[PDB]
Coordinates of C-alpha atoms in Angstrom, one line a residue:
Chain A
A119 CA -50.0 19.9 -21.8
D120 CA -49.3 16.5 -20.9
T121 CA -47.3 14.7 -18.2
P122 CA -44.2 12.8 -19.4
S123 CA -43.2 9.6 -20.6
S124 CA -41.6 7.2 -18.4
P125 CA -37.2 7.8 -18.4
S126 CA -36.0 4.4 -19.7
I127 CA -33.2 3.1 -17.3
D128 CA -30.2 1.7 -19.1
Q129 CA -27.6 1.2 -16.9
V130 CA -27.1 0.2 -13.3
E131 CA -23.5 -0.1 -11.7
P132 CA -24.3 -0.9 -7.8
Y133 CA -21.0 0.2 -5.9
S134 CA -20.7 -0.1 -1.6
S135 CA -23.1 2.2 -1.1
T136 CA -24.0 4.4 -4.0
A137 CA -25.4 3.0 -7.6
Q138 CA -25.3 4.9 -10.7
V139 CA -27.9 5.1 -13.1
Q140 CA -28.2 5.9 -16.5
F141 CA -31.1 6.7 -18.4
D142 CA -32.4 8.2 -21.2
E143 CA -34.7 11.2 -21.6
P144 CA -38.9 10.7 -22.1
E145 CA -39.4 9.6 -25.6
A146 CA -42.5 12.3 -25.0
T147 CA -42.0 15.2 -22.8
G148 CA -45.7 16.0 -22.3
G149 CA -45.6 19.8 -24.4
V150 CA -43.9 20.9 -20.8
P151 CA -39.3 21.2 -20.6
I152 CA -38.9 18.6 -18.1
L153 CA -37.3 20.1 -15.2
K154 CA -36.7 17.4 -12.6
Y155 CA -35.9 13.5 -12.4
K156 CA -37.9 11.9 -9.1
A157 CA -35.4 8.7 -8.1
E158 CA -37.1 5.8 -6.0
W159 CA -35.5 3.0 -4.9
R160 CA -36.5 0.6 -2.4
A161 CA -34.8 -2.5 -0.7
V162 CA -36.2 -5.7 -1.3
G163 CA -39.0 -6.4 1.4
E164 CA -39.8 -3.1 2.2
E165 CA -42.9 -1.5 1.6
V166 CA -41.9 1.8 1.1
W167 CA -40.0 3.7 -1.2
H168 CA -37.2 6.1 -0.9
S169 CA -37.1 8.7 -3.0
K170 CA -35.2 12.0 -4.4
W171 CA -35.4 14.9 -6.6
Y172 CA -32.8 15.3 -9.3
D173 CA -32.0 18.5 -12.1
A174 CA -32.7 17.8 -15.0
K175 CA -29.9 20.1 -16.4
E176 CA -27.4 18.8 -14.1
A177 CA -28.7 14.6 -14.9
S178 CA -28.8 15.0 -18.5
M179 CA -25.2 17.0 -18.4
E180 CA -23.5 13.7 -16.8
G181 CA -25.8 11.1 -18.1
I182 CA -26.5 10.0 -14.7
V183 CA -28.0 10.5 -11.0
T184 CA -25.8 8.4 -8.3
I185 CA -28.5 7.6 -5.2
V186 CA -26.5 7.2 -2.2
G187 CA -26.6 6.2 1.2
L188 CA -27.4 2.5 0.5
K189 CA -26.5 -1.0 2.6
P190 CA -23.7 -2.5 1.7
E191 CA -25.1 -5.9 0.3
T192 CA -28.2 -5.3 0.0
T193 CA -30.6 -6.0 -2.7
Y194 CA -32.6 -2.8 -4.6
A195 CA -35.3 -1.8 -6.8
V196 CA -35.0 1.2 -8.5
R197 CA -36.9 3.3 -11.2
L198 CA -37.9 7.0 -12.4
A199 CA -40.1 9.2 -13.3
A200 CA -39.9 13.2 -14.5
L201 CA -41.7 16.1 -13.9
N202 CA -42.8 18.8 -15.8
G203 CA -44.3 22.2 -15.2
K204 CA -47.8 20.1 -15.6
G205 CA -46.6 17.7 -13.3
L206 CA -45.3 14.1 -12.7
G207 CA -45.5 11.8 -16.0
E208 CA -45.3 7.6 -15.4
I209 CA -42.6 6.1 -13.4
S210 CA -40.4 3.6 -15.5
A211 CA -39.5 -0.5 -14.8
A212 CA -38.4 -1.6 -11.8
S213 CA -34.4 -2.4 -12.4
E214 CA -33.4 -4.9 -9.8
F215 CA -29.6 -5.0 -8.2
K216 CA -27.5 -6.1 -5.0
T217 CA -25.4 -3.5 -3.8
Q218 CA -21.2 -4.8 -3.2
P219 CA -19.7 -5.2 0.1
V220 CA -17.1 -3.2 1.8
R221 CA -13.9 -4.1 1.5
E222 CA -10.0 -3.1 2.6
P223 CA -9.2 0.4 1.0
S224 CA -6.5 -0.6 -1.6
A225 CA -3.4 1.1 -1.4
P226 CA -2.2 4.8 -2.5
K227 CA 0.4 5.4 -5.4
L228 CA 3.0 7.5 -3.2
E229 CA 5.4 10.4 -5.2
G230 CA 8.8 12.6 -4.2
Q231 CA 9.6 15.2 -4.6
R232 CA 12.2 17.5 -3.0
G233 CA 11.7 19.3 0.1
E234 CA 12.8 22.7 1.0
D235 CA 16.2 20.4 2.0
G236 CA 18.6 18.1 1.1
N237 CA 17.3 16.3 4.5
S238 CA 14.1 16.2 4.1
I239 CA 11.8 14.5 0.8
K240 CA 8.0 15.1 0.2
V241 CA 6.2 12.4 -0.2
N242 CA 2.9 13.3 -2.5
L243 CA -0.1 10.8 -1.8
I244 CA -2.3 9.6 -4.9
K245 CA -5.4 8.0 -4.2
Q246 CA -6.9 4.4 -4.8
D247 CA -9.5 2.8 -4.6
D248 CA -11.0 3.4 -1.3
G249 CA -13.1 -0.8 -0.8
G250 CA -16.4 1.0 -0.4
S251 CA -15.6 2.5 2.3
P252 CA -14.7 6.6 3.2
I253 CA -11.3 6.4 4.3
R254 CA -10.1 7.1 8.1
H255 CA -6.4 8.2 7.9
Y256 CA -3.8 7.4 6.6
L257 CA -0.8 6.1 8.5
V258 CA 2.8 6.9 7.7
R259 CA 5.9 4.7 9.0
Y260 CA 9.0 5.5 8.5
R261 CA 12.5 4.7 9.1
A262 CA 17.1 5.0 8.8
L263 CA 16.9 1.6 7.5
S264 CA 18.9 -0.9 10.1
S265 CA 17.5 1.4 12.8
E266 CA 14.1 1.7 14.9
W267 CA 10.6 3.1 13.4
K268 CA 10.3 7.2 14.6
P269 CA 6.7 7.3 16.5
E270 CA 3.8 6.8 13.8
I271 CA 2.3 9.9 11.9
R272 CA -1.8 9.2 11.9
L273 CA -3.0 11.9 8.6
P274 CA -6.9 12.8 7.5
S275 CA -8.3 11.1 4.0
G276 CA -7.9 14.8 3.0
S277 CA -3.8 14.9 3.2
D278 CA -2.5 15.1 -0.5
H279 CA 1.5 14.9 1.4
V280 CA 3.2 14.1 4.1
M281 CA 6.1 16.0 5.1
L282 CA 9.5 15.0 6.6
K283 CA 12.0 17.1 7.6
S284 CA 14.7 17.3 10.3
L285 CA 16.2 13.8 9.0
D286 CA 20.0 12.6 9.2
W287 CA 22.0 13.4 6.6
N288 CA 23.6 11.0 4.0
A289 CA 21.6 8.3 5.3
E290 CA 19.1 5.8 3.6
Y291 CA 14.9 5.8 4.6
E292 CA 11.9 4.1 3.7
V293 CA 8.3 4.9 4.3
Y294 CA 5.5 2.9 5.0
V295 CA 1.9 4.3 3.3
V296 CA -1.7 2.5 4.3
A297 CA -5.2 3.6 4.0
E298 CA -7.7 2.4 6.7
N299 CA -11.2 2.5 6.9
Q300 CA -14.0 1.5 8.7
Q301 CA -13.2 -2.5 7.6
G302 CA -9.4 -2.4 8.0
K303 CA -5.9 -1.3 6.8
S304 CA -4.5 -2.0 3.1
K305 CA -1.7 -2.8 1.7
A306 CA 1.5 -0.7 2.5
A307 CA 2.8 1.6 -0.6
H308 CA 6.4 1.5 0.6
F309 CA 8.6 4.4 -0.8
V310 CA 12.5 4.5 -0.5
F311 CA 14.9 7.1 -0.4
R312 CA 18.2 8.9 0.5
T313 CA 19.4 12.7 2.3
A314 CA 22.0 14.2 0.8
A315 CA 25.6 15.2 2.2
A316 CA 25.0 18.2 3.2
Chain B
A113 CA -18.5 40.3 2.3
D114 CA -17.1 39.1 -0.4
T115 CA -16.4 35.2 -2.2
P116 CA -16.1 32.3 0.0
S117 CA -13.4 30.0 0.8
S118 CA -12.0 26.7 -1.0
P119 CA -13.8 23.6 -0.1
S120 CA -12.3 20.8 0.9
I121 CA -11.6 17.3 0.0
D122 CA -11.8 14.8 2.4
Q123 CA -12.4 11.6 -0.1
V124 CA -11.6 11.4 -3.7
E125 CA -13.2 7.4 -4.7
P126 CA -12.1 6.8 -8.3
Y127 CA -13.5 4.8 -10.6
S128 CA -12.7 3.7 -14.7
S129 CA -14.7 6.8 -16.5
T130 CA -16.4 8.7 -12.8
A131 CA -14.2 9.8 -9.3
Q132 CA -17.2 10.3 -6.2
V133 CA -15.0 13.7 -5.2
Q134 CA -16.4 14.2 -1.0
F135 CA -15.7 17.9 0.4
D136 CA -16.1 20.4 3.1
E137 CA -18.0 23.2 2.2
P138 CA -16.9 26.8 3.2
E139 CA -18.2 29.1 5.8
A140 CA -21.3 31.2 3.7
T141 CA -19.8 34.6 4.0
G142 CA -20.8 38.1 2.6
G143 CA -24.0 37.5 3.9
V144 CA -25.3 35.5 0.6
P145 CA -25.5 31.9 0.2
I146 CA -23.4 29.9 -1.5
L147 CA -24.8 28.9 -5.6
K148 CA -22.8 25.4 -6.5
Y149 CA -19.9 24.1 -6.8
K150 CA -17.1 24.2 -9.7
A151 CA -15.4 21.1 -9.9
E152 CA -11.9 21.1 -11.9
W153 CA -9.9 18.2 -13.0
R154 CA -7.5 18.0 -15.9
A155 CA -5.4 14.2 -16.4
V156 CA -2.0 15.2 -14.8
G157 CA 0.0 16.2 -17.5
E158 CA -2.3 18.5 -19.6
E159 CA -2.6 22.1 -18.6
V160 CA -6.2 22.9 -20.4
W161 CA -8.3 22.1 -17.0
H162 CA -12.2 20.4 -17.7
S163 CA -14.7 21.4 -15.5
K164 CA -18.3 21.1 -14.9
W165 CA -20.6 23.2 -12.1
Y166 CA -22.8 21.2 -9.7
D167 CA -25.9 22.8 -7.5
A168 CA -24.9 23.5 -4.1
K169 CA -28.1 22.7 -2.5
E170 CA -28.2 18.9 -4.5
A171 CA -24.7 18.2 -3.7
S172 CA -25.1 19.2 0.2
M173 CA -28.3 16.7 0.4
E174 CA -25.5 14.1 -2.0
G175 CA -22.8 14.4 0.2
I176 CA -20.7 14.3 -3.2
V177 CA -20.2 15.8 -6.6
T178 CA -19.2 13.1 -9.6
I179 CA -16.8 13.8 -12.3
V180 CA -17.5 11.7 -15.2
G181 CA -16.1 11.1 -18.8
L182 CA -12.6 10.2 -17.6
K183 CA -10.3 7.7 -19.4
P184 CA -9.4 4.1 -17.3
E185 CA -6.2 4.0 -15.5
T186 CA -5.3 7.6 -15.6
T187 CA -3.9 10.5 -13.1
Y188 CA -5.9 13.3 -12.8
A189 CA -5.8 16.4 -10.5
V190 CA -8.9 17.5 -8.7
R191 CA -10.0 21.1 -7.3
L192 CA -12.6 22.2 -6.0
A193 CA -14.4 26.5 -6.2
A194 CA -17.5 27.8 -4.2
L195 CA -19.9 29.9 -6.2
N196 CA -22.0 33.0 -4.6
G197 CA -23.9 35.8 -5.6
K198 CA -20.6 38.3 -4.7
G199 CA -19.2 35.5 -6.9
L200 CA -16.3 32.7 -7.3
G201 CA -14.8 31.4 -4.5
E202 CA -10.8 30.7 -4.7
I203 CA -10.2 26.9 -6.3
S204 CA -8.9 24.5 -3.3
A205 CA -5.5 22.6 -3.7
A206 CA -5.1 19.9 -6.1
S207 CA -5.1 16.4 -5.0
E208 CA -4.2 13.3 -7.1
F209 CA -5.8 10.0 -8.3
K210 CA -5.2 7.2 -10.5
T211 CA -9.0 5.8 -12.4
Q212 CA -9.2 2.3 -12.1
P213 CA -8.8 0.1 -15.2
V214 CA -11.7 -1.3 -17.0
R215 CA -12.8 -5.0 -16.5
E216 CA -15.0 -7.8 -17.7
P217 CA -18.4 -7.6 -16.1
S218 CA -19.6 -9.4 -12.8
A219 CA -21.9 -12.2 -13.2
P220 CA -26.1 -10.9 -13.2
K221 CA -27.6 -13.1 -10.1
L222 CA -30.5 -14.5 -11.3
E223 CA -34.5 -15.4 -9.7
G224 CA -37.3 -17.2 -11.0
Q225 CA -40.7 -16.2 -11.3
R226 CA -43.9 -17.9 -12.6
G227 CA -45.1 -16.9 -16.0
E228 CA -48.7 -16.9 -17.6
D229 CA -48.5 -20.3 -18.0
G230 CA -47.5 -23.3 -16.7
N231 CA -45.4 -24.3 -19.2
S232 CA -43.4 -20.8 -19.1
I233 CA -40.8 -19.3 -16.7
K234 CA -39.6 -15.2 -15.6
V235 CA -36.3 -15.3 -15.0
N236 CA -35.5 -11.8 -13.3
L237 CA -32.0 -10.2 -13.3
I238 CA -30.4 -8.7 -10.3
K239 CA -28.1 -6.8 -12.1
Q240 CA -24.5 -6.3 -10.4
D241 CA -20.8 -4.5 -11.3
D242 CA -20.4 -4.2 -14.9
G243 CA -16.5 -3.5 -14.4
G244 CA -16.5 0.4 -15.0
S245 CA -18.1 0.2 -18.1
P246 CA -21.5 0.0 -19.6
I247 CA -22.8 -3.4 -20.6
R248 CA -23.5 -3.9 -24.0
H249 CA -25.5 -7.3 -24.2
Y250 CA -27.3 -9.8 -21.4
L251 CA -26.0 -12.8 -23.9
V252 CA -29.4 -15.7 -23.0
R253 CA -29.3 -19.6 -23.4
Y254 CA -31.4 -22.1 -22.4
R255 CA -32.3 -25.8 -23.1
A256 CA -34.1 -28.4 -22.3
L257 CA -31.4 -30.7 -20.2
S258 CA -30.6 -33.6 -22.7
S259 CA -30.7 -31.4 -25.9
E260 CA -29.1 -29.4 -27.8
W261 CA -28.9 -24.9 -26.6
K262 CA -31.7 -22.9 -28.1
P263 CA -30.3 -20.0 -30.4
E264 CA -28.9 -16.8 -28.0
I265 CA -31.1 -14.4 -27.0
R266 CA -29.4 -10.9 -26.9
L267 CA -31.2 -9.0 -24.1
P268 CA -30.3 -4.9 -24.1
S269 CA -28.3 -3.3 -21.1
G270 CA -32.2 -1.6 -20.1
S271 CA -33.3 -5.4 -19.9
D272 CA -34.6 -6.7 -16.1
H273 CA -35.9 -10.4 -17.2
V274 CA -36.3 -13.2 -19.3
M275 CA -39.4 -14.6 -20.8
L276 CA -39.5 -18.2 -21.6
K277 CA -42.9 -19.6 -23.1
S278 CA -44.0 -21.9 -25.1
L279 CA -42.5 -24.7 -23.5
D280 CA -42.7 -28.4 -22.9
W281 CA -45.1 -29.4 -20.3
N282 CA -43.7 -31.0 -16.8
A283 CA -39.9 -30.9 -18.9
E284 CA -36.7 -29.6 -17.3
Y285 CA -34.3 -26.9 -18.5
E286 CA -31.6 -24.7 -17.6
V287 CA -31.0 -21.4 -18.6
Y288 CA -27.8 -19.5 -19.1
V289 CA -27.3 -15.5 -18.8
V290 CA -24.2 -13.7 -19.6
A291 CA -23.4 -9.8 -19.1
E292 CA -21.0 -8.2 -20.9
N293 CA -19.2 -4.8 -22.2
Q294 CA -16.4 -3.3 -24.4
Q295 CA -14.5 -5.6 -21.9
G296 CA -15.3 -9.0 -22.5
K297 CA -18.1 -11.3 -21.7
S298 CA -18.2 -12.4 -17.4
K299 CA -18.3 -16.2 -17.0
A300 CA -22.4 -17.6 -16.9
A301 CA -25.2 -17.6 -14.5
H302 CA -27.1 -20.7 -13.7
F303 CA -31.0 -21.8 -13.4
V304 CA -32.3 -24.7 -13.8
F305 CA -36.3 -25.5 -13.6
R306 CA -39.1 -27.5 -14.5
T307 CA -42.2 -26.9 -15.9
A308 CA -46.1 -28.2 -14.6
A309 CA -47.9 -30.4 -15.9

């Protein structure tokens, strides 16, 4: 019959463009189960508050609710409210945070695996911290030691591996993989291998 | 009329115990809409996959789905599936990633504000990276310059400010605030000020 009491904010882990808000359910539900959570955030200096609804069942099974699309290095204020059949409840105290800056991506971990034949190798990618911004491409470079670099390969962020077929036999190669985002390139992850004799 | 194809993972941002997965949805085939997305993850080396459902609509507006309850410094494989009225589509290929290690928290930023009376001040906290693990406490310490440290105050993580009242008038003070999690304490943030006459 009543509206919910305020949710309580426990954590606010800020990232570059997203922020994870950890909270506790309201002490009082008002008499009707909590259906959704209204998140409100505002850039320090703005008047209007941005909002978004979150499903109560999913929110509680996660313990968190992630607000997205924020600007890096900005001070924000964020608060919550619970909505039940009767209506919207009292809003929480406004927690304040500042988002992190976008940094270059860290290097990916590389894992070698056998390819179809002895003169080929498959390099599996193990993703790493991207710096706070989506990864644009993966730049792969390789060569047979003491020899020229084959043409550089560009890979989509979603790529999980890179195959290097039709190589020279009984030859030693080195592969360089770099992760790149809107901010720049990462340190290169190198990997060295040797094809079979025949 | 059938189940949808597999989604496509475009990004996986790993943190310490969570990971943000970005992806492309499949075509909505079969005349019916996509209802949910199934996220599956397994620490590389295990056999049993974990899982969680994500409302399709919410995911589509968010742009990501966040898997939680992961262990730090661990290699995981994640894959996604799309659900619709006719049933669960095919899982996507595994995407591997490694969670970050847990670090100490970063110090919080302090901002001063007037208090109820001229002999008090309100110290607002501007929260910051917690090092990948929940903040346990906010250790605060203040004092009038050229005197001993007042007793330490322990603020719970949900605190947004520290109020210092019943201070001497026309006196100079400084505040020290440290954020602390399981990993340890951060470097302290300072704030010096002077009460009114």
